[PDB]
Design an enzyme around this catalytic site. Structure first.
Site, short mmCIF file in Angstrom:
data_model
loop_
_atom_site.label_atom_id
_atom_site.label_comp_id
_atom_site.label_asym_id
_atom_site.label_seq_id
_atom_site.Cartn_x
_atom_site.Cartn_y
_atom_site.Cartn_z
N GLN B 26 0.83 -1.20 0.00
CA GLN B 26 0.00 0.00 0.00
C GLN B 26 0.86 1.25 0.00
OE1 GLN B 26 -0.58 0.74 4.62
NE2 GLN B 26 -1.79 -1.06 4.03
N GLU B 92 -4.30 3.26 -0.19
CA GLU B 92 -5.07 3.44 1.04
C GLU B 92 -5.42 4.91 1.17
OE1 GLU B 92 -2.96 2.29 4.50
OE2 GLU B 92 -4.48 3.12 5.80
N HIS B 119 4.29 11.70 -5.99
CA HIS B 119 3.20 11.28 -6.83
C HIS B 119 3.01 9.79 -6.74
CE1 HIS B 119 6.71 11.47 -9.75
NE2 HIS B 119 6.31 10.25 -10.07
N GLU B 165 1.05 10.55 -11.99
CA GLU B 165 1.75 10.44 -13.25
C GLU B 165 1.02 9.46 -14.15
OE1 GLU B 165 6.08 10.00 -13.04
OE2 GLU B 165 5.97 8.55 -14.71
C1 LIG Z 1 -3.32 3.84 10.47
O1 LIG Z 1 -4.28 2.80 10.34
C2 LIG Z 1 -4.14 1.59 9.67
C3 LIG Z 1 -4.68 0.41 10.26
C4 LIG Z 1 -5.30 0.35 11.56
C5 LIG Z 1 -6.12 -0.65 11.85
C6 LIG Z 1 -6.21 -1.33 13.15
O2 LIG Z 1 -5.73 -0.84 14.20
C7 LIG Z 1 -6.77 -2.72 13.10
C8 LIG Z 1 -7.38 -3.36 14.18
C9 LIG Z 1 -7.91 -4.63 14.04
C10 LIG Z 1 -7.84 -5.29 12.82
O3 LIG Z 1 -8.36 -6.55 12.72
C11 LIG Z 1 -7.24 -4.67 11.74
C12 LIG Z 1 -6.72 -3.40 11.89
C13 LIG Z 1 -4.56 -0.82 9.62
C14 LIG Z 1 -3.97 -0.97 8.40
C15 LIG Z 1 -3.39 0.13 7.78
O4 LIG Z 1 -2.84 -0.13 6.55
C16 LIG Z 1 -3.49 1.41 8.37
O5 LIG Z 1 -2.92 2.45 7.67
C1 LIG Z 2 9.55 11.14 -11.06
O1 LIG Z 2 8.70 10.50 -12.03
C2 LIG Z 2 9.21 10.34 -13.29
C3 LIG Z 2 9.88 11.39 -13.97
C4 LIG Z 2 10.01 12.71 -13.37
C5 LIG Z 2 9.27 13.75 -13.75
C6 LIG Z 2 9.02 14.93 -12.89
O2 LIG Z 2 9.48 14.93 -11.76
C7 LIG Z 2 8.17 16.07 -13.36
C8 LIG Z 2 7.46 16.85 -12.43
C9 LIG Z 2 6.64 17.90 -12.82
C10 LIG Z 2 6.52 18.21 -14.17
O3 LIG Z 2 5.73 19.25 -14.58
C11 LIG Z 2 7.23 17.47 -15.10
C12 LIG Z 2 8.04 16.41 -14.70
C13 LIG Z 2 10.31 11.14 -15.27
C14 LIG Z 2 10.18 9.91 -15.87
C15 LIG Z 2 9.52 8.89 -15.19
O4 LIG Z 2 9.36 7.66 -15.73
C16 LIG Z 2 9.01 9.11 -13.91
O5 LIG Z 2 8.37 8.10 -13.28
ZN LIG Z 3 7.34 9.08 -11.47
ZN LIG Z 4 -1.68 1.71 6.11
#
Ligand SMILES: COc1c(/C=C/C(=O)c2ccc(O)cc2)ccc(O)c1O
Ligand SMILES: COc1c(/C=C/C(=O)c2ccc(O)cc2)ccc(O)c1O
Ligand SMILES: [Zn+2]
Ligand SMILES: [Zn+2]
Lengths: 176, 176
Positions: B26, B92, B119, B165
């Protein structure tokens, strides 16, 4: 009080055929020092560097990391770009040249004001064993598995202070 | 001048066997208005909502989006969470309850001080067709495919202003 299940679903549409082959290819993070970042994501987290691009005029580089077998990386330069940029779930790290020797520069992790981006997350088979190893390797933690409310879930920090959740999909649910 | 290819690869260690099942699961973004965000990610980009989690004490919800066939999503609650959270390349979305009613609030996209996150990126078969449709739908662009020097590459914005992107992995053997 947030959206009901029904109300959220009613804001979802079916996938238009125009999107049928789209894939979520990359998350981009800016890194102060590629040397430390590459060490961490490869040696600590077990990713592979699959592709590196350099842009001499604009003074930056891109590094693409992914959980791929390095044996699957095409041998030939242009097929390699096409294969790497068509892998799901890559991390793209951008290095603006010079930042690694700028004591007054640092990137922001999104978890303090002003917030936005929060974290990337790695699914693992065993959060505790992962994090015992992380502790042994000197990794900084935001949250050890047993800290706080949400037992069994951890957050570590990369060399720039980006948060990385460590979660076991199969223990999520059987919780709180 | 950044790292040479050789120097960068020198900083990369092979994966420890303990990480061999890890996957990049994620990327978390906070969203002001989950109604708008769900509409954008599903109708515009053709992702699927695969799980929703509500946390009434902490006053927030989570929405997991992915490029997954809705017909693969498990009917049973526990099995659904385990499946969703084991999918690669999810998005997420975090909704902190009440932000959508607060004209003074917005999240930060990481592309202006303080910078960090940049991005997410969607791989598409054709940047120009995809972008033509985004324009018919009134999507907000950051960079149209032919603006700037990196022709054939685009950036759009989701309802929170996060950058996305739009890249074609099979044409990109011209850039770098
Ligand atoms: C900041 O909060 C989160 C949480 C937060 C989720 C929980 O605390 C949780 C509790 C019980 C259960 O069965 C599953 C999850 C879980 C996943 C995640 O990717 C994330 O960003
Ligand atoms: C950072 O992401 C990239 C880049 C990078 C491109 C840039 O950072 C960018 C940002 C703003 C704008 O107006 C133009 C370009 C170039 C090629 C590629 O494959 C990729 O994933
Ligand atoms: Zn990129
Ligand atoms: Zn998470």
């Amino acid at each position: 009080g947030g959206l009901t299940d029904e109300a959220a679903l009613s804001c979802c549409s079916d996938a238009d055929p125009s999107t049928k082959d789209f894939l979520l290819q990359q998350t981009m993070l800016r890194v102060k020092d590629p040397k430390k970042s590459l060490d961490f994501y490869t040696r600590v987290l077990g990713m592979t560097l699959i592709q590196k691009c350099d842009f001499p005029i604009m003074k930056f580089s891109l590094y693409f990391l992914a959980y791929e077998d390095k044996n699957d990386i095409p041998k030939e330069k242009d097929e390699k770009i096409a294969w790497a940029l068509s892998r799901k779930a890559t991390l793209e790290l951008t290095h603006n040249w010079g930042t690694e020797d700028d004591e007054t520069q640092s990137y922001h992790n999104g978890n303090s004001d002003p917030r936005g981006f929060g974290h990337i997350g790695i699914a693992v088979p065993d959060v505790y064993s992962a994090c015992k190893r992380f502790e042994e390797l000197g990794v900084k933690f935001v949250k050890k598995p047993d800290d706080g409310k949400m037992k069994g879930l951890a957050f570590i920090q990369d060399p720039d202070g980006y948060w990385i959740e460590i979660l076991n999909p199969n223990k999520m649910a059987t919780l709180m």
